[PDB]
Amino acid sequence: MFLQYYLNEQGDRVYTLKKFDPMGQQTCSAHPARFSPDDKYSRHRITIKKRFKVLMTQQPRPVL
Amino acid sequence: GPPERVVLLGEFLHPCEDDIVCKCTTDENKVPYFNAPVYLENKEQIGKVDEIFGQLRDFYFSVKLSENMKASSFKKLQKFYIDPYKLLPLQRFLPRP
Amino acid sequence: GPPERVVLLGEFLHPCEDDIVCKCTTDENKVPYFNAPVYLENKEQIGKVDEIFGQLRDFYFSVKLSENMKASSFKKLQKFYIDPYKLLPLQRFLPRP
Amino acid sequence: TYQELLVNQNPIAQPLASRRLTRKLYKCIKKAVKQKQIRRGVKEVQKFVNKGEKGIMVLAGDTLPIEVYCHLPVMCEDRNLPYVYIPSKTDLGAAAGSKRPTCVIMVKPHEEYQEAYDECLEEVQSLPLP
Amino acid sequence: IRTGFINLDKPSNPSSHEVVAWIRRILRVEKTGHSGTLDPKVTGCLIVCIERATRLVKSQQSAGKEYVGIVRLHNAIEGGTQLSRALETLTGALFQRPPLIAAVKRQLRVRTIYESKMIEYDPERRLGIFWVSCEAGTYIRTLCVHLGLLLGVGGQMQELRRVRSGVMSEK
Amino acid sequence: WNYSFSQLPRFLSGSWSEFSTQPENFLKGCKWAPDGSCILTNSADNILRIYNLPPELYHVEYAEMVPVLRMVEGDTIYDYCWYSLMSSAQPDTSYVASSSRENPIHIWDAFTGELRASFRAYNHLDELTAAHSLCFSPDGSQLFCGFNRTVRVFSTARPGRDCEVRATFAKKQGQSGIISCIAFSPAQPLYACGSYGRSLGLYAWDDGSPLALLGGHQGGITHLCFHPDGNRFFSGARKDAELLCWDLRQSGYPLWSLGREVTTNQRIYFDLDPTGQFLVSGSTSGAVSVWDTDGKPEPVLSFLPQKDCTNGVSLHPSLPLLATASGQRVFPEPTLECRLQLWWCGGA
């Protein structure tokens, strides 16, 4: 849809309409991916998120 | 709920079979709505206008009293008050020009 | 029909998509009823109150105009009037003590 | 110009095609679109990988969020289908004769561009895997 | 899990009651609550309380929200500063008519907008990003209509996302 | 003066320079005012432009045409039209309706170019929906406008959200899809709706009750024209080679089919004479074709305004003037300018 964003230097979302940020990188869509409850590709997403070290379990653990 | 203000409707005459007959004394001879709430000057509802009768410029009205009220309570020439929006002008009942 | 009297509701600001936006200037900061008829001081109905918006003590209202009216007709700071019974007190919308 | 698009790549966009291989893949897509032998959406590509239709699956390496298409790499590895990433989604759409972008295309084989298809297929399978 | 909650990023198709239904199928639990409705096409922060955490839902539902939305204006304005001033006007305790439901006309009510900000404006498409911090139960669709009336050009809420639900945010 | 396509139309001034401001701009049709005073043009920049009739016609070289008005919209313009009963003698009649993406139906004053009124169509959720088509009634009292599965009828006198809603699809029965064009019969008390769902529908004016439902076309219908007889009418579609001729008598099946190259998802216009004898149509190739309607319509002429798509064609109601709008969407590749033009079609 219309809302895009890019991250500033302290990790906050900076919302914008424009497809490119002030440093020339592409802006992400603000909205998450569309979900289906009948999705059967859980194995597949874990498989390659593990491979490229971007699964949520492999990130730095949050400070609570 | 309780209205912002109330205007003089009329004064108490004799009771009649557990409701109260009252002489109407409105400014400009205005006529109340049927089932219009009747208040005392403290803005407490005593009843509702049941009957309207008599001559056009000298008319009476009976008041069907509230659940908690009794017809013996009221004194002679005690005034009653009405929400000014459920009055109507006398011209409405007078004939068309 | 036409009401017995009308009280100052508000003044004309800019039009907006064939209805008219108006700054509310009532005595005691009273708030109009939704779909309350809006009159000019001649007691002629121009429209009805559609939207009410803005801060509590400085609010606006749009007027959905009548069949025969046009939004171009009205001048800046032209006053509009309402039947005083379809106003409400501000205290109603303020929080309970 | 190519190196500027390399900033926008995903975490999961490997193996990325070489600059010349990217050019070969676009030219193969143009010929396949003319012959009416491609599939464009995730919706489509997912449907025909399930049916078991063979083809080179070209992915856009700047797709975000990755959840929209990150199941497809493993769907290919289950069926031994050859897949490859390319720098941008806009160019992948532009290769298919479209102004709007797309994140994935599957090129089917055909007689009219069989030699170009086999040239692309050979280099895709030869890529180093992460 | 029975004493827990999820800080969910709600997707853009389903209703908020459908989303928490899907969560209670997946996790295989009997009860869930959801920190205030997001409308079917709205995304963002939705605190989903599970089981014994549903005892906290009133505190979560009553908490202050934040939104990032897009207003689409129906005619051109002078510039981004004019939209920025209309947002400053609609700060503080505002009148808002609650929408009709089952032909039950709810009365005009008051809701506070704590802060407003005009983030970006596009004169070509007549689109404006706004950020709003507000009380629970504020109608942002209604805010965009009023913002359009106040400018004189007219307007509608194109898009919406909730970036904060009380204690939890998208950060 | 009278129309004659025994000879190729002579060139008369057009405008190219202002359309070349934006990259990959293109015209989206052209329409004469019903009195013949001026011509209205849509473009991919979302700017309606009005050009006056050339003074040098009545006064040889002609200068490049300049528009007397530019009236900017903020989004894709789906449809636009002159008021049905326009005359340049009356400021109250000279105005232009215009619908745009996620916007109200705007009414623009044709002299000053100010926003004069707004008609607003809301769905059941109270969200604004934009009209994909526009048509004034032959009296000029009502403004018909097409949406997904429904026509709305605003009263021209009362601008606003107030409208009579007319559903064309009820419990999976009737005319489905976005209603892309409306047109009224000059003689009969009816109107015809074309849809992007393949079908045509006829409807009675007063009630909106279906008179007929017609197939024929192999793509989404984009335009309609009634013949001045009242019986006969014509239709055209996107990505569809045939321009279908119909008749209100002997209904249910199209009488004839006229060939034209349409290879894009475009509203390629076509128009009749005021007298009703000739029929002119554009093409994605560029070639403007002409048929004599007075049996099957006979091909009279084919000529090329430019080496590009001729999307718009408009015939002047009094004079023998053909207007032509050009341009189309260019498709990219991994790493001629569009124009309005006038043409004299009078006899020797």
Swiss-Prot record, chain A:
Changing residue 6 to C: In PFBMFT9; uncertain significance. GO terms for biological process: pseudouridine synthesis; rRNA pseudouridine synthesis; snRNA pseudouridine synthesis; telomerase RNA localization to Cajal body; telomere maintenance via telomerase. It comes from the Eukaryota. Keywords: Cataract, Deafness, Disease variant, Dyskeratosis congenita, Nucleus, Ribonucleoprotein, Ribosome biogenesis, rRNA processing. Transmembrane segments: none annotated. InterPro entries: H/ACA_rnp_Nop10, H/ACA_rnp_Nop10_sf. GO terms for molecular function: box H/ACA snoRNA binding; RNA binding; telomerase RNA binding. It is found in: Nucleus, Nucleolus; Nucleus, Cajal body. SUPFAM superfamilies: Nop10-like SnoRNP. One of its GO terms (cellular component) is telomerase holoenzyme complex. Pfam families: Nop10p. Its main location: nucleus. Belongs to the NOP10 family. Part of the H/ACA small nucleolar ribonucleoprotein (H/ACA snoRNP) complex, which contains NHP2/NOLA2, GAR1/NOLA1, NOP10/NOLA3, and DKC1/NOLA4, which is presumed to be the catalytic subunit. The complex contains a stable core formed by binding of one or two NOP10-DKC1 heterodimers to NHP2; GAR1 subsequently binds to this core via DKC1. The complex binds a box H/ACA small nucleolar RNA (snoRNA), which may target the specific site of modification within the RNA substrate. During assembly, the complex contains NAF1 instead of GAR1/NOLA1. This is H/ACA ribonucleoprotein complex subunit 3. It comes from Homo sapiens. The lineage of its organism: Eukaryota, Metazoa, Chordata, Craniata, Vertebrata.
Swiss-Prot record, chains B, C:
There is a cross-link at residue 70 (Glycyl lysine isopeptide (Lys-Gly) (interchain with G-Cter in SUMO2)). Part of the H/ACA small nucleolar ribonucleoprotein (H/ACA snoRNP) complex, which contains NHP2/NOLA2, GAR1/NOLA1, NOP10/NOLA3, and DKC1/NOLA4, which is presumed to be the catalytic subunit. The complex contains a stable core formed by binding of one or two NOP10-DKC1 heterodimers to NHP2; GAR1 subsequently binds to this core via DKC1. The complex binds a box H/ACA small nucleolar RNA (snoRNA), which may target the specific site of modification within the RNA substrate. The complex also interacts with TERC, which contains a 3'-terminal domain related to the box H/ACA snoRNAs. GO terms for biological process: snoRNA guided rRNA pseudouridine synthesis; telomere maintenance via telomerase. This is H/ACA ribonucleoprotein complex subunit 1. The gene is GAR1. It comes from Homo sapiens. Interaction with SMN1 requires at least one of the RGG-box regions. The keyword Repeat applies. It is found in: Nucleus, Nucleolus; Nucleus, Cajal body. Keywords: Isopeptide bond, Nucleus, Repeat, Ribonucleoprotein, Ribosome biogenesis, RNA-binding, rRNA processing, Ubl conjugation. Transmembrane segments: none annotated. Belongs to the GAR1 family. GO terms for cellular component: box H/ACA scaRNP complex; box H/ACA snoRNP complex; box H/ACA telomerase RNP complex; chromosome, telomeric region; fibrillar center; nucleoplasm; telomerase holoenzyme complex. GO terms for molecular function: box H/ACA snoRNA binding; RNA binding; telomerase RNA binding.
From Swiss-Prot, chain E:
There is a cross-link at residue 105 (Glycyl lysine isopeptide (Lys-Gly) (interchain with G-Cter in SUMO2)). The active site is at 39 (nucleophile). Ubiquitously expressed. Transmembrane segments: none annotated. Part of the H/ACA small nucleolar ribonucleoprotein (H/ACA snoRNP) complex, which contains NHP2/NOLA2, GAR1/NOLA1, NOP10/NOLA3, and DKC1/NOLA4, which is presumed to be the catalytic subunit. The complex contains a stable core formed by binding of one or two NOP10-DKC1 heterodimers to NHP2; GAR1 subsequently binds to this core via DKC1. The complex binds a box H/ACA small nucleolar RNA (snoRNA), which may target the specific site of modification within the RNA substrate. During assembly, the complex contains NAF1 instead of GAR1/NOLA1. Belongs to the pseudouridine synthase TruB family. This is H/ACA ribonucleoprotein complex subunit DKC1. It comes from Homo sapiens.
From Swiss-Prot, chain F:
Induction: (Microbial infection) Over-expressed following infection by Epstein-Barr virus. WD repeats lie at residues 22-59, 73-118, 123-164, 174-215, 216-256, 262-296. It is found in: Nucleus, Cajal body; Chromosome, Telomere; Chromosome. The modification Phosphothreonine is found at residue 335. One of its GO terms (molecular function) is identical protein binding. Keywords: Chaperone, Chromosome, Disease variant, DNA damage, DNA repair, Dyskeratosis congenita, Host-virus interaction, Nucleus, Phosphoprotein, Repeat, RNA-binding, Telomere, WD repeat. The keyword DNA damage applies. Expressed in all tissues and cell lines examined. Changing residue 227 to Y: In DKCB3; shortened telomeres; disrupts telomerase localization to Cajal bodies resulting in misdirection of telomerase RNA to nucleoli. One of its GO terms (biological process) is RNA folding. Belongs to the TCAB1 family. RNA chaperone that plays a key role in telomere maintenance and RNA localization to Cajal bodies. Specifically recognizes and binds the Cajal body box (CAB box) present in both small Cajal body RNAs (scaRNAs) and telomerase RNA template component (TERC). Essential component of the telomerase holoenzyme complex, a ribonucleoprotein complex essential for the replication of chromosome termini that elongates telomeres in most eukaryotes. In the telomerase holoenzyme complex, required to stimulate the catalytic activity of the complex. This is Telomerase Cajal body protein 1. The gene is WRAP53. The chain holds residues 146 to 522 of 548 of the full protein.
